């Protein structure tokens, strides 16, 4: 009926490879049978199962690499955030909040007061 990705997340690195090989065998023999049959809609199920298995395998591989590169400078660029080239040229919040000590003394000494015209 099709593999289910949530049941794929619970498998290991070898079970998913063996199931990928099994699915590719099924696709090959179904592709032989398509020659002798006028229609065969069950090609599509095995093809989407292959896609789902490869998706789960890539999720496990990329999360393993993120756990290896976790909490340090220079992650790989595919694991860095893709926002926008200008949004990562982009002075950070720290750099945009840098203030010289003269300006910081002025900002502490004379902040914008809160006031009202009533009395």
């Amino acid at each position: 009926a099709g593999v289910k990705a949530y049941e794929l997340r619970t498998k290991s690195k070898e079970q998913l490879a063996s199931q990928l090989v099994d699915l590719k065998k099924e696709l090959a023999e179904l592709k032989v049978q398509k020659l002798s049959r006028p229609s065969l809609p069950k090609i599509k199920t095995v093809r989407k199962s292959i896609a789902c298995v490869l998706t789960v395998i890539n999720e496990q591989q990329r999360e393993a690499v993120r756990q290896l590169y976790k909490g340090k400078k220079y992650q790989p660029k595919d694991l860095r955030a893709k926002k926008t080239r200008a949004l990562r040229r982009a002075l950070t919040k720290f750099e945009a909040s840098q203030v010289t000590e003269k300006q910081r003394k002025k900002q502490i000494a004379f902040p914008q007061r809160k006031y009202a015209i009533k009395a």
Binding site: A86, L91, F94, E95, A96, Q98, V99, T100
Partner: protein
């Protein structure tokens, strides 16, 4: 001077546009200097430039550029304004000192064409301004 390009020194318009040889190039040689250095060092931002020396064939300028990606520049509030993307190629838009000098950006009656930029001024002064209730 700037020789007008015009093959065999030829216009092909009115006699007022026939001259080739005493034409003067509205931007300064210092502005040309900073544009060429900005193209060579496109990763940097031109800040200023200064005359150092000259002979008959060349003038010589030194150009100060700032790296907007170096963290000594990206920290230190006095200079990280240069990291703003509105400051890419200031020397190509006329935002250096010699650029604003050649654009005519100064205060007062001597600069009535050029205070907000003369193409902006020309568009303002050649726009027809119509209201809903006609004036």
């Amino acid at each position: 001077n700037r020789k007008r390009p015009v093959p065999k020194g030829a216009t092909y318009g009115k006699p007022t546009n026939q001259g080739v040889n005493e034409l003067k190039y509205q931007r300064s040689l210092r502005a040309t200097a900073e544009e060429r250095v900005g193209r060579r060092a496109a990763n940097l931002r031109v800040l200023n430039s200064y005359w150092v020396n000259q002979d008959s064939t060349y003038k010589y300028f030194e150009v100060i550029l700032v790296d907007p990606q170096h963290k000594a520049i990206r920290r230190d509030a006095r200079y990280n304004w240069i990291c703003d993307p509105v400051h890419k190629h200031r020397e190509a838009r006329g935002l250096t000192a010699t650029g604003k000098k050649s654009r005519g950006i100064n205060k007062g009656h001597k600069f009535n064409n050029t205070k907000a930029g003369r193409r902006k001024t020309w568009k303002r002064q050649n726009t027809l301004s119509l209201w809903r209730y006609r004036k």
